[PDB]
Design a protein around this ligand. Sequence first.
Ligand SMILES: Nc1nc2c(c(=O)[nH]1)N[C@@H](CNc1ccc(C(=O)N[C@@H](CCC(=O)O)C(=O)O)cc1)CN2
Length: 362
Amino acid sequence: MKRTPLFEKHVELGAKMVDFAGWEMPLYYTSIFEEVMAVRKSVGMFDVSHMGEFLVKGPEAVSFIDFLITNDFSSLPDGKAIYSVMCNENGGIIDDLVVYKVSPDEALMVVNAANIEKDFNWIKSHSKNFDVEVSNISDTTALIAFQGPKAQETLQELVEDGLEEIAYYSFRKSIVAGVETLVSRTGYTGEDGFELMLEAKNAPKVWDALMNLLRKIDGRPAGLGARDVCRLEATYLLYGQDMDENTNPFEVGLSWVVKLNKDFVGKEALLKAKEKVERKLVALELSGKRIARKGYEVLKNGERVGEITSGNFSPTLGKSIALALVSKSVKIGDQLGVVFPGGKLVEALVVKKPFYRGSVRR
Ligand SMILES: Nc1nc2c(c(=O)[nH]1)N[C@@H](CNc1ccc(C(=O)N[C@@H](CCC(=O)O)C(=O)O)cc1)CN2
């Protein structure tokens, strides 16, 4: 498996490893529940260096990104980031990501681990008519997510500039524990928090410095297990599970990141699509302690209406929760059925999204 520059720290911390997207990563250190609670109560530090970072440099950096992503990057001002999706010619979703508008001549794209290759190949094969140079800097870049309601007050004493001045989905180059670091007020938890992008070689010392602070305010380093529970609770999508090239943004509740008034790949296909939105992604709350897995059929009074995309147990709500891609006719309040292995039916209630929202801003 692949190992991030923090692998050794995770091993010395006694974490249980799991194979995620080809990477040897920590599922949890102590326990998934405990780590989710650190995120929900104080702060949870995540090693997310398995994700990829692409660099776009050149006079037409803005318009290139604007051509590739569904969201409006052309209007973003320096130091602003934007969550978006990338579609193919048919409106299918290649990946979801975050792009940073450093300046008119430079942007940073951060994508999902399992899609680094596919994304980079797709991005590079579309640079031809743009005055830009695209490069993958993943191999030497690390990324750390410091999430939690106490994240800011805790991280601050190691950062040279005022964190308070960084607005939600905004970033700024700064020094953290003595090293050049891009600090953005972003996250995948639904709580307030930050993401620290830095040179892989400096990851160990930044992580060690931060760990010293965590023990002091009762925080915890957190694994992918907690990362998955927190994002599902926050109701953020997971590419490959809740969406893929066989779903368009409209079917998975991401219409808001699609601006049809500008030009981009998949635009024409999306115009037609939005006129016929037949599927939707709904939030379910199941009876029992069993966890639904992707692919389980979802029924309504005996008739199939879709399938599970993501499942997990929410300690915050104390319920088995899940996301499901179902027919347009499914409504909030419906009593559905999830078929578990062996035809075992499990009741589920369609509830309003998102399941939970913490201290995350804006
Ligand atoms: N760097 C960064 N980049 C990433 C991820 C990350 O983990 N951090 N993970 C993948 C993308 N997944 C998401 C999904 C949702 C959000 C998110 O934050 N959503 C808010 C956005 C609000 C807004 O833009 O105003 C919401 O309410 O829907 C962030 C990353 C790929 N790139």
